[PDB]
Amino acid sequence: DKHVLSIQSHVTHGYVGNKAATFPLQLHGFDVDAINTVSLSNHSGYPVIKGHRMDLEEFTTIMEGLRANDFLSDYAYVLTGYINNRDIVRQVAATVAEIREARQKQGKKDAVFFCDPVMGDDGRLYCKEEVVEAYRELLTHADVATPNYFEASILSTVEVKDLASAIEAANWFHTQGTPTVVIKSFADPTHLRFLLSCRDTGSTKRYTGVVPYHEGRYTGTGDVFAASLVAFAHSDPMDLAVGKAMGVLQDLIKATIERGGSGKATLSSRELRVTSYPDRLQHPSSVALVTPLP
Amino acid sequence: DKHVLSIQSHVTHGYVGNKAATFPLQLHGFDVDAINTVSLSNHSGYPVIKGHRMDLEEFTTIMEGLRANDFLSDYAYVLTGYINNRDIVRQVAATVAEIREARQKQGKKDAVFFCDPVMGDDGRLYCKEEVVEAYRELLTHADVATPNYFEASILSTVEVKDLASAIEAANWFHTQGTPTVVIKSFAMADDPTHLRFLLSCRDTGSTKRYTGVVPYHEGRYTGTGDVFAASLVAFAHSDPMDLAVGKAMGVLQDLIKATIERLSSRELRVTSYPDRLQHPSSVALVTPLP
Ligand SMILES: Nc1ncnc2c1ncn2[C@@H]1O[C@H](COP(=O)(O)OP(=O)(O)O)[C@@H](O)[C@H]1O
Ligand SMILES: Nc1ncnc2c1ncn2[C@@H]1O[C@H](COP(=O)(O)OP(=O)(O)O)[C@@H](O)[C@H]1O
Ligand SMILES: COCc1c(CO)cnc(C)c1O
Ligand SMILES: COCc1c(CO)cnc(C)c1O
Ligand SMILES: [Ca+2]
Ligand SMILES: [Ca+2]
Ligand SMILES: [Ca+2]
Ligand SMILES: [Ca+2]
Ligand SMILES: [Ca+2]
Ligand SMILES: [Ca+2]
Ligand SMILES: [Ca+2]
Ligand SMILES: [Cl-]
């Protein structure tokens, strides 16, 4: 059951995409089968970024290898992150559907598809325009979505500025056909607030909580968060899984600042210290409270 | 300090190349910077292999980004494994030379280049043809080489069948310019229940040699070399090379036994006993030869 197909970026330097997601999932006892959508020198925050990008043909080629070897029924979980390719984003829906069919033919429980719609952050799109719409279409097929507040804003067309606006953005996701939505953080300038929204019933259960806001811009935080969320949600209800994943991020951001990745440090300095405290990836030193809304 | 550039394969399914190497090195506290020479569905033993292979331009393009962002002096270790491309094998020499330069300019400890000359196993050359000659050239620049007995044999032209012949093959690597050689295992006609390893350390022109055995476990495994070289880089960071070989051998013995108790089934269970990757249940004896 602890087998994930993870479709995200690969970077040589630093910690984003599959490099960031893989180590935490492995520590939690998951086999991570990674399809690397790009193979780049580093994340898009650096003045230079070089390397290879998948086209649709490269993606369907990997899929043929997985299909022919009868590996598709293995994937209890599908996790998508950085793709930044309209054709490959569109193709994920067929990939997930083909996995669901292979699992049913093997008498396995249905897969769970976690979609992190990786498009941008700090108010800037760092992925192409056509990709926004392809994510709206893919999200109709996702079980869980983990947008940052920028992505939630551009998908729903609702400016996520507060709890109320986060809820309207999350209701859009549910109407779209995504049952479970985490808006991972949004605007007490010393804390960030998050929303978990679960639509069955036609009813929606909603939860909130807060985490300390650390001064500085981090990269890879969403990627570690979604990987952590898959790992905890395998054996926790989603509210607890969110709280534990928030706790993991707090430990990792604090370790990064301690090793000298403050607000004013270099991009290299601010790379998440994903490997520094492996025990704290499985067992965070705090678990954020995730409290029902009325 | 604990920063490795790892030039090996990526596979979606299973545990070879950077999939065998990365999790152990991360558990030991190393940042692993991976260049994925291929991105394939699975290792070469399955009925179907699909995926992307780098060309030279793809490799030198990645290098361009690493150079441009000033990352090259970070690499205290360079670890190469599966490449299976003559042009990239030859390019590694320039990549190491540029890292050596960047670290010397910055007054850092000399980089250590661990070359695993990945070409074949089980008597079969699963990699291309003139890759062999390219590895003989690259090995002129290696600090540590970790061939299997097949690779040691094809590179040196000595059939490695015992300790005498392992020493002849190692001596070839020393003459080519690699000071430190691990021939990871060979069978012995005269000792069928054991695999023997050799560690050979050329200095004065003197050579210190060490040997020992592990049990010869039934069956055929993949990823064993890749986890061995990664573990060796990890242990050799703080341990003398003899004790480092001993611990790496112990790690592999725990993994093979953990694989035996659990092709899809004979994949190395690399992530199943994270404790055993750092602190193996036992270390192999690695004893000096007189
Ligand atoms: N500056 C920060 N201070 C505190 N927590 C943060 C900070 N940046 C990120 N996080 C944590 O990382 C998680 C994911 O980060 P977020 O910015 O929401 O996603 P992304 O990295 O995808 O843009 C948040 O839910 C929060 O727990
Ligand atoms: N059948 C086996 N029994 C015991 N140890 C083995 C066996 N196969 C591999 N090993 C271990 O794994 C290490 C690397 O395997 P080896 O076969 O020498 O290289 P490769 O996997 O590159 O061919 C060996 O040094 C040894 O510790
Ligand atoms: C700022 O970098 C964005 C980014 C992310 C997600 O944070 C993931 N992969 C790659 C390749 C990226 O460039
Ligand atoms: C077992 O197949 C051999 C192999 C290895 C070395 O184990 C490494 N990478 C790839 C891509 C391989 O196919
Ligand atoms: Ca963010
Ligand atoms: Ca739906
Ligand atoms: Ca960010
Ligand atoms: Ca993100
Ligand atoms: Ca072998
Ligand atoms: Ca083998
Ligand atoms: Ca090998
Ligand atoms: Cl012998």
XYZ file of C-alpha atoms and ligand atoms in Angstrom:
672
model
C 0.000 0.000 0.000
C 2.930 2.495 0.641
C 3.852 3.096 -3.016
C 3.578 6.624 -4.582
C 3.982 7.662 -8.237
C 5.448 11.191 -7.887
C 5.406 13.437 -11.014
C 7.535 16.539 -10.164
C 10.813 18.302 -11.118
C 14.384 17.088 -10.505
C 17.064 19.674 -9.600
C 20.795 18.908 -9.190
C 21.415 21.769 -6.658
C 18.938 22.449 -3.816
C 15.591 21.092 -2.569
C 12.420 21.466 -4.644
C 10.155 18.962 -6.440
C 11.010 15.229 -6.329
C 14.339 15.720 -4.489
C 12.408 17.463 -1.598
C 9.395 15.066 -1.667
C 11.344 11.797 -2.024
C 13.503 11.726 1.177
C 10.552 12.441 3.549
C 8.335 9.802 1.838
C 11.196 7.196 1.999
C 11.745 7.913 5.742
C 7.969 7.253 6.241
C 8.448 3.796 4.562
C 7.054 4.649 1.071
C 8.491 3.478 -2.234
C 8.641 6.680 -4.326
C 8.446 6.002 -8.103
C 9.495 9.470 -9.526
C 8.761 10.685 -13.081
C 11.020 13.774 -13.424
C 9.084 16.381 -15.535
C 12.309 18.499 -15.792
C 15.991 17.829 -14.981
C 17.476 21.249 -14.176
C 20.585 22.714 -12.487
C 18.499 24.429 -9.733
C 15.094 26.036 -8.973
C 13.734 29.079 -10.887
C 14.715 31.596 -8.087
C 18.391 31.634 -9.303
C 19.502 34.129 -12.008
C 20.433 31.102 -14.265
C 18.507 27.808 -14.716
C 19.679 25.194 -17.224
C 18.741 21.690 -18.321
C 16.234 19.344 -19.881
C 12.387 19.599 -20.005
C 10.074 16.626 -20.766
C 7.662 16.900 -23.739
C 4.405 14.819 -23.838
C 6.269 12.094 -25.863
C 8.890 11.604 -23.030
C 6.071 11.293 -20.453
C 4.036 8.717 -22.511
C 7.347 6.826 -23.129
C 7.920 6.410 -19.320
C 4.214 5.473 -18.921
C 4.646 2.679 -21.575
C 7.553 1.201 -19.498
C 5.426 1.307 -16.335
C 2.379 -0.227 -18.163
C 4.335 -3.013 -19.967
C 6.026 -4.122 -16.650
C 2.606 -4.168 -14.811
C 3.747 -1.509 -12.256
C 0.596 0.714 -12.533
C -1.489 -1.375 -10.029
C 1.319 -0.674 -7.395
C 0.420 3.035 -7.037
C -1.874 3.458 -3.997
C -0.998 7.210 -4.253
C -0.346 9.623 -7.114
C 1.362 12.941 -6.199
C 1.864 15.716 -8.788
C 3.864 18.932 -8.351
C 6.056 20.920 -10.810
C 5.156 20.031 -14.410
C 4.857 23.425 -16.196
C 3.718 21.659 -19.405
C 0.068 21.937 -20.527
C 0.121 18.565 -22.418
C 1.653 16.594 -19.501
C -0.706 18.249 -16.947
C -3.674 17.234 -19.195
C -2.204 13.653 -19.508
C -2.165 13.138 -15.679
C -6.001 12.561 -15.677
C -5.560 9.561 -18.110
C -2.564 8.281 -16.024
C -4.627 8.322 -12.740
C -7.699 6.720 -14.482
C -5.440 3.929 -15.880
C -3.984 3.353 -12.382
C -7.534 3.162 -10.870
C -8.505 0.522 -13.525
C -5.302 -1.594 -12.904
C -5.940 -1.525 -9.111
C -9.636 -2.583 -9.411
C -8.622 -5.483 -11.800
C -6.148 -6.576 -8.970
C -8.794 -6.275 -6.140
C -6.921 -3.311 -4.554
C -8.499 -0.266 -2.831
C -8.823 2.820 -5.042
C -5.783 5.131 -5.442
C -5.661 8.653 -3.914
C -4.512 11.456 -6.278
C -2.872 14.442 -4.546
C -2.501 17.386 -6.982
C -0.201 20.293 -6.018
C -0.985 22.762 -8.837
C 2.568 24.216 -9.000
C 2.375 27.494 -10.994
C 3.814 30.399 -8.964
C 4.473 32.076 -5.606
C 5.205 35.545 -4.049
C 2.574 36.943 -6.546
C 4.533 35.832 -9.729
C 3.604 33.038 -12.205
C 6.854 31.058 -12.858
C 5.075 28.571 -15.118
C 3.346 29.269 -18.509
C -0.195 30.772 -18.903
C -1.975 27.815 -20.745
C -0.969 25.675 -17.677
C -3.454 27.507 -15.366
C -6.463 26.211 -17.361
C -4.984 22.686 -17.729
C -4.832 22.628 -13.839
C -8.491 23.726 -13.528
C -9.371 20.705 -15.807
C -7.047 18.253 -13.974
C -8.338 19.351 -10.520
C -11.817 17.976 -11.467
C -10.078 14.526 -11.247
C -7.978 15.169 -8.067
C -8.908 13.708 -4.627
C -6.766 16.259 -2.679
C -5.400 19.704 -3.818
C -2.680 21.713 -1.963
C -2.477 25.121 -3.699
C -0.554 27.997 -2.141
C -2.717 31.167 -1.836
C -1.377 32.571 -5.141
C -2.408 29.351 -7.028
C -5.785 29.202 -5.228
C -6.321 32.881 -6.275
C -5.482 32.443 -9.998
C -7.412 29.118 -10.343
C -10.654 30.341 -8.594
C -10.279 34.064 -9.677
C -10.846 34.922 -5.906
C -8.093 37.125 -4.252
C -7.144 34.995 -1.174
C -6.328 37.717 1.410
C -8.057 36.186 4.500
C -10.091 33.240 5.878
C -13.383 34.339 4.164
C -11.667 34.684 0.742
C -9.760 31.328 1.281
C -13.240 29.685 1.870
C -14.700 31.172 -1.403
C -11.515 29.958 -3.272
C -11.878 26.463 -1.669
C -15.668 26.350 -2.550
C -14.657 26.951 -6.223
C -12.303 23.877 -6.018
C -15.144 21.725 -4.566
C -17.618 22.936 -7.277
C -14.825 22.067 -9.857
C -14.924 18.480 -8.388
C -11.962 18.405 -5.910
C -13.336 16.981 -2.604
C -10.417 17.964 -0.248
C -8.503 21.279 -0.506
C -5.675 22.623 1.686
C -4.867 26.346 1.194
C -1.493 25.999 2.880
C -1.021 29.601 4.140
C -2.391 33.186 3.887
C -2.414 36.525 5.861
C -1.339 39.366 13.127
C 1.658 39.681 10.729
C 3.616 37.236 13.041
C 1.432 34.180 12.088
C 0.125 32.535 8.881
C -3.367 30.937 8.812
C -4.318 27.833 6.738
C -7.644 26.334 5.562
C -8.630 22.666 5.236
C -11.956 22.295 3.372
C -13.610 18.834 2.866
C -16.739 18.467 0.640
C -18.626 15.074 0.653
C -23.832 14.883 1.466
C -22.998 18.146 -0.454
C -21.866 19.411 3.015
C -18.390 20.965 3.641
C -16.360 20.429 6.890
C -13.832 23.278 7.294
C -10.852 23.654 9.628
C -8.327 26.368 10.373
C -5.150 26.872 12.378
C -2.033 29.057 12.436
C 1.765 28.614 12.377
C 4.471 31.161 13.305
C 5.441 33.343 10.268
C 9.241 33.249 9.713
C 10.694 36.365 7.943
C 12.196 35.359 4.560
C 11.066 33.632 1.328
C 11.612 29.824 1.181
C 11.466 27.439 -1.800
C 10.476 23.748 -1.603
C 8.119 24.332 1.395
C 4.984 23.329 -0.581
C 6.782 20.295 -2.042
C 7.810 18.997 1.420
C 4.319 19.849 2.752
C 2.399 17.779 0.072
C 4.861 14.832 0.445
C 4.406 15.001 4.272
C 0.597 15.223 3.815
C 0.536 12.021 1.686
C 2.702 10.233 4.294
C 0.538 11.246 7.369
C -2.854 10.960 5.573
C -2.028 7.238 4.882
C -2.615 6.572 8.637
C -4.251 9.826 10.008
C -7.570 11.617 9.319
C -6.795 14.570 7.023
C -7.094 17.260 9.774
C -4.388 15.504 11.880
C -2.292 14.854 8.707
C -2.395 18.646 7.926
C -1.378 19.521 11.537
C 1.586 17.065 11.430
C 2.691 18.293 7.958
C 2.549 21.926 9.306
C 4.762 20.740 12.253
C 7.283 19.124 9.859
C 7.517 22.451 7.924
C 8.054 24.429 11.157
C 11.013 22.159 12.173
C 12.531 22.344 8.637
C 12.171 26.197 8.318
C 13.719 26.618 11.841
C 16.661 24.226 10.971
C 17.183 26.260 7.734
C 17.291 29.587 9.688
C 19.607 28.002 12.376
C 22.104 26.751 9.671
C 22.037 30.496 8.641
C 19.166 30.714 6.023
C 17.605 33.941 7.526
C 15.603 36.551 5.480
C 18.821 38.402 4.327
C 20.931 35.261 3.350
C 21.700 33.941 -0.212
C 19.306 31.604 -2.148
C 21.772 28.698 -1.442
C 21.663 29.586 2.311
C 17.807 29.620 2.168
C 17.501 26.179 0.412
C 15.463 23.972 2.848
C 17.737 21.797 5.063
C 15.655 18.696 4.100
C 18.370 16.154 5.264
C 19.435 17.864 8.573
C 16.874 16.285 10.985
C 15.438 13.086 9.476
C 13.667 12.056 12.766
C 11.810 15.444 12.721
C 10.499 14.637 9.168
C 8.608 11.599 10.672
C 8.038 12.990 14.219
C 7.885 16.806 14.235
C 8.681 18.607 17.521
C 5.208 20.326 17.324
C 1.889 19.425 15.615
C -0.240 22.453 14.603
C -3.840 22.423 15.903
C -6.464 22.035 13.144
C -9.756 23.272 14.633
C -13.261 22.900 13.148
C -15.070 26.008 11.849
C -18.738 26.303 12.897
C 31.540 19.758 3.831
C 29.369 16.612 3.115
C 28.376 17.503 -0.508
C 28.532 14.902 -3.374
C 27.991 15.411 -7.130
C 26.492 12.023 -8.127
C 26.514 11.292 -11.897
C 24.416 8.101 -12.333
C 21.044 6.810 -13.670
C 17.519 7.606 -12.486
C 14.840 4.861 -12.643
C 11.163 5.468 -11.808
C 10.661 1.860 -10.505
C 13.213 0.172 -8.192
C 16.671 0.765 -6.762
C 19.715 1.209 -9.040
C 21.941 4.200 -9.795
C 21.000 7.489 -8.035
C 17.892 5.564 -6.656
C 20.268 3.178 -4.781
C 22.841 5.897 -3.872
C 20.891 8.966 -2.759
C 18.822 7.813 0.286
C 21.858 6.230 2.082
C 24.057 9.327 1.481
C 21.180 11.597 2.673
C 20.719 9.437 5.851
C 24.492 9.986 6.552
C 23.924 13.820 6.338
C 25.259 14.340 2.740
C 23.655 16.718 0.243
C 23.470 14.622 -2.955
C 23.509 16.773 -6.146
C 22.388 14.238 -8.818
C 23.012 14.497 -12.576
C 20.744 11.772 -14.019
C 22.611 10.368 -17.100
C 19.404 8.489 -18.049
C 15.792 8.737 -16.786
C 14.301 5.258 -17.397
C 11.267 3.245 -16.310
C 13.425 0.584 -14.514
C 16.771 -1.276 -14.578
C 18.050 -3.314 -17.568
C 16.851 -6.742 -16.206
C 13.105 -6.094 -16.861
C 11.415 -7.188 -20.142
C 10.814 -3.520 -21.131
C 13.051 -0.461 -20.577
C 11.772 2.945 -21.727
C 12.918 6.491 -21.161
C 15.296 9.372 -21.864
C 19.130 9.190 -22.189
C 21.317 12.338 -21.913
C 23.582 13.355 -24.788
C 26.807 15.322 -24.262
C 24.992 18.732 -24.897
C 22.444 17.882 -22.113
C 25.341 17.176 -19.674
C 27.359 20.325 -20.557
C 24.080 22.394 -20.324
C 23.556 21.236 -16.708
C 27.263 21.984 -16.016
C 26.624 25.518 -17.438
C 23.946 26.166 -14.750
C 26.136 24.716 -11.950
C 29.123 26.867 -13.143
C 26.985 30.058 -13.610
C 25.510 29.898 -10.017
C 29.020 29.140 -8.542
C 28.070 25.646 -7.157
C 31.190 23.705 -8.337
C 33.396 24.420 -5.233
C 30.589 22.788 -3.113
C 31.559 19.248 -4.375
C 33.958 17.672 -1.809
C 33.077 14.344 -3.519
C 32.250 13.387 -7.116
C 30.665 9.940 -7.468
C 30.087 8.488 -10.944
C 28.097 5.337 -11.759
C 25.882 4.344 -14.723
C 26.579 6.665 -17.731
C 26.814 4.202 -20.692
C 27.791 7.068 -23.065
C 31.458 7.451 -24.345
C 31.187 11.291 -24.708
C 29.842 11.866 -21.117
C 32.413 9.369 -19.683
C 35.169 11.442 -21.361
C 33.505 14.792 -20.186
C 33.585 13.666 -16.480
C 37.398 14.211 -16.611
C 36.880 17.959 -17.477
C 34.008 18.248 -14.890
C 36.287 16.852 -12.111
C 39.225 19.082 -13.234
C 36.904 22.179 -13.078
C 35.665 21.164 -9.552
C 39.332 20.584 -8.409
C 40.190 24.129 -9.721
C 37.131 25.821 -8.067
C 37.957 24.161 -4.676
C 41.757 24.954 -4.920
C 40.937 28.630 -5.768
C 38.676 28.631 -2.636
C 41.323 26.912 -0.429
C 39.070 23.866 0.210
C 40.226 20.211 0.724
C 40.976 18.448 -2.601
C 37.788 16.849 -4.020
C 37.720 12.978 -3.918
C 36.562 11.427 -7.239
C 34.987 7.961 -6.697
C 34.674 6.260 -10.128
C 32.352 3.229 -10.341
C 33.076 2.028 -13.922
C 29.510 0.722 -14.557
C 29.694 -1.524 -17.710
C 28.208 -4.967 -16.871
C 27.643 -7.864 -14.465
C 26.943 -11.644 -14.511
C 29.461 -11.961 -17.427
C 27.419 -9.601 -19.734
C 28.431 -6.126 -21.000
C 24.976 -4.420 -20.533
C 26.627 -1.080 -21.513
C 27.917 -0.046 -25.030
C 31.282 -0.906 -26.722
C 33.955 1.994 -26.721
C 32.657 2.916 -23.206
C 35.457 0.497 -22.000
C 38.303 2.527 -23.540
C 36.685 5.792 -22.222
C 36.739 4.400 -18.634
C 40.464 3.442 -19.027
C 41.130 7.176 -19.851
C 38.820 8.475 -17.097
C 40.512 6.169 -14.476
C 43.796 8.184 -15.059
C 42.002 10.969 -13.042
C 40.111 8.900 -10.343
C 40.968 9.006 -6.597
C 38.963 5.814 -5.768
C 37.639 3.174 -8.229
C 35.060 0.523 -7.227
C 34.783 -1.942 -10.147
C 32.939 -5.327 -9.824
C 35.101 -8.330 -10.849
C 33.722 -8.237 -14.437
C 34.711 -4.528 -14.881
C 38.155 -5.021 -13.217
C 38.771 -7.960 -15.652
C 37.688 -6.177 -18.911
C 39.565 -2.899 -17.984
C 42.930 -4.556 -16.943
C 42.610 -7.650 -19.307
C 43.311 -9.826 -16.158
C 40.632 -12.528 -15.412
C 40.005 -11.797 -11.685
C 39.408 -15.340 -10.303
C 41.400 -15.154 -6.966
C 43.484 -12.865 -4.701
C 46.662 -13.078 -6.941
C 44.686 -12.043 -10.091
C 42.661 -9.365 -8.157
C 46.069 -7.844 -7.153
C 47.267 -7.929 -10.857
C 43.989 -6.163 -11.938
C 44.276 -3.557 -9.040
C 47.974 -2.955 -9.978
C 46.781 -2.056 -13.533
C 44.413 0.620 -12.032
C 47.349 2.002 -9.960
C 49.560 2.154 -13.172
C 46.649 3.878 -15.068
C 46.676 6.519 -12.211
C 43.968 5.514 -9.615
C 45.660 5.428 -6.152
C 42.816 3.549 -4.318
C 40.962 0.484 -5.714
C 38.170 -1.673 -4.270
C 37.427 -4.867 -6.248
C 34.072 -5.349 -4.476
C 33.695 -9.151 -4.711
C 34.986 -12.173 -6.634
C 34.166 -15.884 -6.353
C 36.909 -18.368 -5.364
C 36.940 -21.907 -6.861
C 38.883 -22.985 -3.715
C 36.286 -21.279 -1.306
C 32.803 -21.643 -2.826
C 30.728 -20.319 0.217
C 32.509 -16.891 0.381
C 33.059 -13.791 -1.780
C 36.470 -12.097 -1.431
C 37.154 -8.356 -1.791
C 40.454 -6.470 -2.217
C 41.367 -2.916 -1.108
C 44.602 -1.717 -2.799
C 46.183 1.641 -1.822
C 49.140 2.935 -3.935
C 51.151 5.725 -2.207
C 56.988 6.122 -2.175
C 55.447 3.813 -4.901
C 54.493 1.329 -2.101
C 51.083 -0.452 -2.137
C 49.110 -1.342 1.047
C 46.657 -4.211 0.383
C 43.765 -5.502 2.527
C 41.338 -8.382 2.036
C 38.439 -10.194 3.663
C 35.319 -12.145 2.795
C 31.562 -12.046 3.035
C 29.184 -15.009 2.784
C 28.300 -15.806 -0.875
C 24.449 -15.437 -0.608
C 22.247 -17.405 -3.085
C 20.827 -15.540 -6.070
C 21.482 -12.376 -8.114
C 20.906 -8.769 -6.908
C 20.833 -5.329 -8.550
C 21.785 -2.001 -6.916
C 24.486 -3.747 -4.755
C 27.410 -1.850 -6.363
C 25.528 1.459 -6.320
C 24.640 1.232 -2.582
C 28.210 -0.068 -1.892
C 29.947 2.957 -3.549
C 27.538 5.442 -1.856
C 28.052 3.786 1.564
C 31.870 3.826 0.939
C 31.803 7.598 0.230
C 29.739 8.042 3.484
C 32.035 5.917 5.747
C 35.380 7.083 4.176
C 34.421 10.737 5.040
C 35.347 10.053 8.751
C 36.922 6.518 8.738
C 40.200 5.167 7.347
C 39.489 3.428 3.998
C 39.923 -0.137 5.474
C 37.251 0.457 8.227
C 35.055 2.285 5.628
C 35.158 -0.828 3.316
C 34.329 -2.982 6.372
C 31.225 -0.907 7.276
C 30.036 -0.675 3.597
C 30.364 -4.510 3.326
C 28.278 -4.833 6.560
C 25.586 -2.501 5.153
C 25.304 -4.638 1.968
C 25.146 -7.879 4.034
C 22.137 -6.453 6.070
C 20.406 -5.271 2.826
C 20.843 -8.648 0.991
C 19.596 -10.589 4.057
C 16.691 -8.022 4.428
C 15.971 -8.564 0.662
C 16.108 -12.404 1.143
C 13.496 -12.320 4.058
C 11.011 -9.902 2.260
C 13.052 -9.033 -10.468
C 10.472 -6.802 -8.618
C 11.109 -9.059 -5.499
C 15.010 -9.147 -5.930
C 15.108 -5.298 -6.036
C 17.298 -4.126 -3.066
C 14.986 -2.946 -0.216
C 17.226 0.165 0.198
C 14.816 2.235 2.371
C 13.420 -0.638 4.568
C 16.098 -0.597 7.428
C 17.385 3.013 7.533
C 19.162 2.180 10.857
C 21.141 -0.690 9.123
C 22.459 1.798 6.418
C 24.187 3.917 9.155
C 25.008 1.167 11.757
C 25.206 -2.260 10.095
C 24.504 -5.326 12.364
C 28.200 -6.289 11.715
C 31.316 -4.968 9.902
C 33.407 -7.245 7.612
C 37.019 -7.739 8.794
C 39.348 -5.845 6.429
C 42.846 -7.199 7.202
C 46.235 -6.092 5.827
C 48.165 -8.468 3.501
C 51.882 -8.866 4.341
N 7.759 32.047 5.895
C 7.144 30.998 6.431
N 6.932 30.968 7.771
C 6.277 29.911 8.287
N 5.843 28.801 7.684
C 6.081 28.861 6.361
C 6.713 29.881 5.679
N 6.786 29.589 4.320
C 6.243 28.396 4.219
N 5.787 27.905 5.415
C 5.210 26.609 5.698
O 5.286 25.831 4.523
C 3.963 25.449 4.102
C 3.911 25.516 2.607
O 4.320 26.825 2.233
P 3.397 27.683 1.242
O 4.054 28.977 1.026
O 1.986 27.705 1.730
O 3.513 26.838 -0.117
P 4.524 27.051 -1.412
O 5.923 26.790 -0.836
O 3.988 26.027 -2.355
O 4.298 28.422 -2.009
C 3.011 26.393 4.840
O 1.766 25.753 5.086
C 3.751 26.632 6.155
O 3.548 25.564 7.052
N 25.520 -12.798 -3.654
C 26.115 -11.967 -2.810
N 26.368 -12.407 -1.558
C 26.923 -11.551 -0.703
N 27.284 -10.281 -0.884
C 26.983 -9.859 -2.115
C 26.415 -10.619 -3.108
N 26.242 -9.847 -4.244
C 26.662 -8.649 -3.897
N 27.175 -8.606 -2.622
C 27.658 -7.464 -1.841
O 27.434 -6.268 -2.553
C 28.692 -5.631 -2.882
C 28.651 -5.109 -4.300
O 28.243 -6.198 -5.175
P 29.132 -6.537 -6.444
O 28.404 -7.617 -7.130
O 30.557 -6.696 -6.043
O 29.041 -5.250 -7.399
P 27.911 -4.910 -8.528
O 26.587 -4.977 -7.885
O 28.411 -3.535 -8.971
O 28.180 -6.003 -9.575
C 29.757 -6.695 -2.605
O 30.992 -6.113 -2.193
C 29.131 -7.510 -1.463
O 29.273 -6.878 -0.212
C 11.068 28.748 -7.274
O 11.199 27.451 -7.855
C 9.952 26.895 -8.208
C 10.138 25.433 -8.498
C 9.451 24.456 -7.732
C 8.428 24.821 -6.646
O 8.695 25.727 -5.532
C 9.656 23.124 -8.128
N 10.481 22.739 -9.136
C 11.152 23.672 -9.826
C 12.041 23.266 -10.962
C 10.961 25.042 -9.554
O 11.666 25.984 -10.273
C 20.510 -3.795 -13.412
O 20.663 -2.889 -14.500
C 21.913 -2.211 -14.487
C 21.779 -0.727 -14.220
C 22.529 -0.097 -13.218
C 23.544 -0.874 -12.414
O 22.937 -1.745 -11.469
C 22.365 1.268 -13.043
N 21.492 2.004 -13.754
C 20.760 1.418 -14.708
C 19.826 2.261 -15.520
C 20.875 0.034 -14.951
O 20.088 -0.616 -15.863
Ca 4.674 30.366 -0.754
Ca -13.912 14.949 -8.907
Ca 8.405 30.279 -1.917
Ca 4.513 25.454 -4.383
Ca 27.784 -8.247 -9.336
Ca 24.001 -7.806 -10.169
Ca 27.657 -2.288 -10.696
Cl 41.560 -16.150 -3.209
